[PDB]
C-alpha cells in the first residue's frame, strides 16, 4: 500500500485463494473428464529471488484473472457477493504492485520488458477463455476453470 515492504507485494495474497475456495458450488470430482490441461507456464514465477523480474508478470496475471471473472458470464456463473470481495482483493494486489513501480521498486528496464513472459500468461488465459466458449460456459467448465486458476495463482504465492 506504500511499497514499504517489497517482499510482501511481489507475492500473491492468501485471501485470493481463500475467496476462490468459497466461490465453489458444484463438487470438484463431479466434473469427471470434463477438463483440459491448460498448460500454465510455471516457469514464469516463484523463482526464489529475482522477484524484480516478477512484478509485471504477477501484475498481468491478476489483471487477467480480473478480466476473466469480470465478464457477464462470470457474473452469471458465480455469487455476486463473493465476486465483489474477489475484485476487491484482486484490486488490492494491483494497487500494491503499482505502488512499488510508481516509487522505483521493481521497474522493468530490460530489453524485452518481460513481454515474452507476459505473452505466456496471456496465451494461458486465451485458452481458458476458449475452453469456456467451447464448453458453452457449463457449470463444470467453470468449476474446472475456478480450480485451475486457484492452482495457477498459488504458484505466485507463499505456499
Amino acid at each position: 500500500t506504500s511499497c514499504d515492504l517489497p517482499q510482501t507485494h511481489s507475492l500473491g495474497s492468501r485471501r485470493t485463494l481463500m475467496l476462490l475456495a468459497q466461490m465453489r458450488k458444484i463438487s470438484l470430482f463431479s466434473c469427471l473428464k470434463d477438463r483440459h490441461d491448460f498448460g500454465f507456464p510455471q516457469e514464469e514465477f516463484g523463482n526464489q529471488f529475482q522477484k524484480a523480474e516478477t512484478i509485471p508478470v504477477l501484475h498481468e496475471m491478476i489483471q487477467q484473472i480480473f478480466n476473466l471473472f469480470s465478464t457477464k458470464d462470470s457474473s452469471a456463473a458465480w455469487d455476486e457477493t463473493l465476486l465483489d470481495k474477489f475484485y476487491t482483493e484482486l484490486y488490492q494486489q494491483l494497487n500494491d504492485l503499482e505502488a512499488c513501480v510508481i516509487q522505483g521498486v521493481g521497474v522493468t528496464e530490460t530489453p524485452l520488458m518481460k513481454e515474452d513472459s507476459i505473452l505466456a500468461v496471456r496465451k494461458y488465459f486465451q485458452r481458458i477463455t476458449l475452453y469456456l466458449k467451447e464448453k458453452k460456459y457449463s457449470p463444470c467448465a467453470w468449476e474446472v476453470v475456478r480450480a485451475e486458476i486457484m492452482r495457477s495463482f498459488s504458484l505466485s504465492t507463499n505456499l
Partner: antibody
Framework: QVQLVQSGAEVKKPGASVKVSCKAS????????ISWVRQAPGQGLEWMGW????????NYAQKFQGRVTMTTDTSTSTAYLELRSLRSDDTAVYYC?????????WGQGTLVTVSS | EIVLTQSPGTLSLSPGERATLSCRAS???????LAWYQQKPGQAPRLLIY???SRATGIPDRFSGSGSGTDFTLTISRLEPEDFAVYYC?????????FGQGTKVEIKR
Amino acid sequence: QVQLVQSGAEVKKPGASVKVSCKASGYTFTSYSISWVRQAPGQGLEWMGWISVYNGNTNYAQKFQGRVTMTTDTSTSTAYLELRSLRSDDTAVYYCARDPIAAGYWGQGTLVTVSS
Amino acid sequence: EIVLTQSPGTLSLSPGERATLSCRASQSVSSTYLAWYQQKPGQAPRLLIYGASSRATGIPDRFSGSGSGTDFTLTISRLEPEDFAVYYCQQYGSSPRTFGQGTKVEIKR
C-alpha cells in the same frame, strides 16, 4: 457503487493557492492510493502525482515538485490537493483518480481558474 | 520520461466503419502497464482497456486493444454513434505516469 466526488469550482488570482478536495465512498478509503490528473481547457490529460492514502507516501511530476502537496484525511475519507503560487496556466479541470488503473474509478473533476 | 505520441490526431469515419487508434511510446513499455480511455465533452476520462487488451466492465466487445514494445493499438471493430469521442492511451509502469495527446474520432458525413 464506488464514487469519488470532488469540491466545487475555484477562481483564484496568480500567486494564491487552491486546496481542491475529493471525497471517496463505496470502499475503504485507506486501502487504495489516489493520484491527480489535470486537464487545461482543450488539451490532454496531465498526471501530477500520487499518494498512498494508507501510509502517506507521495510521488510527483517534476513540474509540480515542491509547489504541490497532496494529503488525505482518513476520518473524512477525503483526499486533498494543494497547489501553491498559482499561475494563469494552472487554469484546468483537476481530477482525482483511484488506483489501480484497472479500477477505472475517477472523480467528476474540479475546475480551478487562475487569472488576474 | 516516456512520451506517448498518438496517431492520427483526428480520425474521421462513418458509423459501421473500423477505427484504428495508434499509441507510440518514446521507449518500450510492458504491455501490462498500458491503458486506454475515452472522454466526451464535459466528462471525466473513462477506462476502456487496461493491461493493453482487457476490456473494462461495461465496455462492449467491439473494443479491442493490442501492442507491445513501443507500439500499441485500440481498434473499434464497428463504430456506433455512442463511440465518437476523444481517446487517450496511458502508460503506468514508471515514474511520471504519462498520457498520449489524444485522437478525436469524429463522425464523417
